[PDB]
Each structure stands twice: as structure tokens, then as C-alpha cells.
Amino acid sequence: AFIVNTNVPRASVPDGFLSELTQQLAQATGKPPQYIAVHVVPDQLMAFGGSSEPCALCSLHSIGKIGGAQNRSYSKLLCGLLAERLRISPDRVYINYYDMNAANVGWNNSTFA
Amino acid sequence: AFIVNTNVPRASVPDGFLSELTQQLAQATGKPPQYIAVHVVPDQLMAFGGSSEPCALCSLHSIGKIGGAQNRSYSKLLCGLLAERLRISPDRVYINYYDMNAANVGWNNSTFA
Amino acid sequence: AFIVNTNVPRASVPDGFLSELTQQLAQATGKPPQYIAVHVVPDQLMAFGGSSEPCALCSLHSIGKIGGAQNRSYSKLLCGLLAERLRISPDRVYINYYDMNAANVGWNNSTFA
């Protein structure tokens, strides 16, 4: 799943943003879009560097598809999207990447193990 | 702690839901309910598989009590509650499990180490 | 980043709270305040020990500066702030500490690796 928490207001999140994230992450990770879950949380009380200018804190959790070169590529993609769509400067974005073990991901009454 | 983020609206979360999560997680983990913390976040902007049908993204963090068989059992329990109480299909739920080191959990001005 | 989720209402969060967090975390971790990100989420549906008295579930993610003694010191600091500013008892606070690999933190179109 990909989560974005931001102080940008809800009205500034364009219609279609969750779909675009879904599509671009499917493409970037090489996973079918049926597996991709996205969550956007606007209107947050947040600061970055002490400033309340637009910012984002995000997380990308994946079973595999995480690593040094991949995460550089995801960061370019996702900063690009946040800059274009939400008008958040890339230097005011953090994204934490998490390589999840299949045994530690529940789904459909079981886990992926 | 157990956290559930969902697009299901607040009005659809039944009375008693946090209490029932607390009780059933105490029972499933074998921990006294005094230790259990629960957090439910409805009304979220979320998609799963590109669809906005009811879904959930959840986390369970625990100092121990995490593992292959345990996490399957937690998933059956928790998907069952989400399906019964919130009408979320089990195949539209992800739960990330985290086995926390006691030195990495703060509480009461210190950590559990 | 430091994130606090609480059932305390927004009106009970004092002016200056994000800034005081930012200043005190910079001091505690050594890190320049320009890189510190903070996020406060009030008005949450949460329970701790089955009770809805004020409580908080927090996360602190850092590239390094995490460890047994450091996390104890962060907990004293952060519990003290939550007690003084939000009137939350320290024994109703959990803080999860995460030592992030630089390759798993995206910022400014790249990662910190």
C-alpha cells in the first residue's frame, strides 16, 4: 500500500488522483493493479522544517520490489506526482519504504506466506 | 496496537467496535486487555485494486506474539470482524504485522526494554 | 518524522505545539530542525486498555539516532510534552521507534543512500 499524509486541503486533491497513483504504482512495481492499495489523507496538521508550507509524509509497503535502485526510482515518480498534482515541493516530501515479509501481511483471512 | 484505516463512514462503525477489538485481540494474543490499544479511522480516501468499494488498511504491532501461524490466526479473526461489523470483504483488507523489539517501544516515560 | 495520533480534541492542542515538537526533537536527536517533520492527528477514535480516557499512539522514524538509551530519553521527552500540553498520562502513550535504512527513505526525488 501507498499512503500519503499531507497538509494540502481536500479540495486541492484532484479527482482521479487515487486512480493515477494506482496505475503508476502498478507500472512501477510490475504488480497487477488489483493488488495496489492507495490512501490519501489531506488537511493534516503537519510541519516540515518548522514550516507549514505544503508538505507530505508517505509510506510504501510492498512484498518485495523494494531496494536501493527501485526506491530511487519510486521517489522520483512519487515526488513528481505530488509536485504536479498537489503542488508539494519534492524537498518537503519524505517517503518511507518497507519490504514486507509475506508472512507478515494479512489478506483474505490468512497471510501471503 | 491495532490500527484500522477504512473508507467506511463513521456512521457505519457500530457502537462497541473498539471494545470488541480490544477484547478479541487480548484473547488472541494472550495479553491482558490493559496493554491493548486500538485505533479506528473511518471516512478515508482510499482505493484497493482501483476500486472505492469498502476496504481497509490495518497494522498490528506487538512485542512478540507475531509469527507465521499466529499472523494467520489474527488475520482470520480480524477479517472476520471487519466483514461482520463494517461489511468489508476479506479480500479488500491488508494487515501489516510488526514484531517490535521491546527497546523500540516507548511507554510511561521509558521503553519496555 | 514524528507522528502523534490522539483522541484529545483539536481545540485542546495548544498553539505552538508543532513548533515545540520540532525544536525539542531537533535538540534531542542533534539533527537540524530544517529536516524534522512532525504530524499531529487529534480527535481520533481510540482506546487504550479498553478505556477512552486521553491516550496517544505515536511513531518516531529516524535514520539512526535510535537505540536503547536514546529511545528512553526520547520517551521521557515526548511523554513529558504530551502530559504537559495535551494532558495525556504517560502510561497511556505508546511510541514506536523505527531505525530506517537511508536507502529506504525517499526525499527530493531520490533517497538518502
Curated annotation (Swiss-Prot), chains A, B, C:
Compartments in which it is found: Secreted; Cytoplasm
GO biological process: carboxylic acid metabolic process; cell surface receptor signaling pathway; cellular senescence; DNA damage response, signal transduction by p53 class mediator; inflammatory response; innate immune response; negative regulation of apoptotic process; negative regulation of cell migration
SUPFAM superfamilies associated with the record: Tautomerase/MIF (SSF55331)
Any one GO cellular component localisation term in the record: plasma membrane
Pfam families for this protein: MIF (PF01187)
Main subcellular localisation: secreted
MF annotations from Gene Ontology: chemoattractant activity; cytokine activity; cytokine receptor binding; dopachrome isomerase activity; identical protein binding; phenylpyruvate tautomerase activity; protease binding
Modification type N6-succinyllysine: residues: 76
Induction annotation: Up-regulated in concanavalin-A-treated lymphocytes. Up-regulated in macrophages upon exposure to M.tuberculosis antigens.
Positions annotated to bind substrate: 31, 63, 96
Effect of residue 109 to C: Causes formation of interchain disulfide bonds with Cys-79 from another subunit
Reactions it catalyzes: 3-phenylpyruvate = enol-phenylpyruvate; L-dopachrome = 5,6-dihydroxyindole-2-carboxylate
E.C. no: 5.3.2.1, 5.3.3.12
Residues carrying N6-acetyllysine: 76
Keyword Cytoplasm in record: yes
InterPro entries: Macrophage_inhib_fac, Macrophage_inhib_fac_CS, Tautomerase/MIF_sf
Enzyme class: isomerase
Something else known: Serum levels of MIF are elevated in patients with severe sepsis or septic shock. High levels of MIF are correlated with low survival. Drugs that inhibit tautomerase activity protect against death due to sepsis.
Function: Pro-inflammatory cytokine involved in the innate immune response to bacterial pathogens. The expression of MIF at sites of inflammation suggests a role as mediator in regulating the function of macrophages in host defense. Counteracts the anti-inflammatory activity of glucocorticoids. Has phenylpyruvate tautomerase and dopachrome tautomerase activity (in vitro), but the physiological substrate is not known. It is not clear whether the tautomerase activity has any physiological relevance, and whether it is important for cytokine activity.
Family membership noted in the UniProt record: Belongs to the MIF family.
Disease: Rheumatoid arthritis systemic juvenile: An inflammatory articular disorder with systemic onset beginning before the age of 16. It represents a subgroup of juvenile arthritis associated with severe extraarticular features and occasionally fatal complications. During active phases of the disorder, patients display a typical daily spiking fever, an evanescent macular rash, lymphadenopathy, hepatosplenomegaly, serositis, myalgia and arthritis.
Assembly with partners or alone: Homotrimer. Interacts with CXCR2 extracellular domain. Interacts with the CD74 extracellular domain, USO1, COPS5 and BNIPL.
Protein name (record): Macrophage migration inhibitory factor
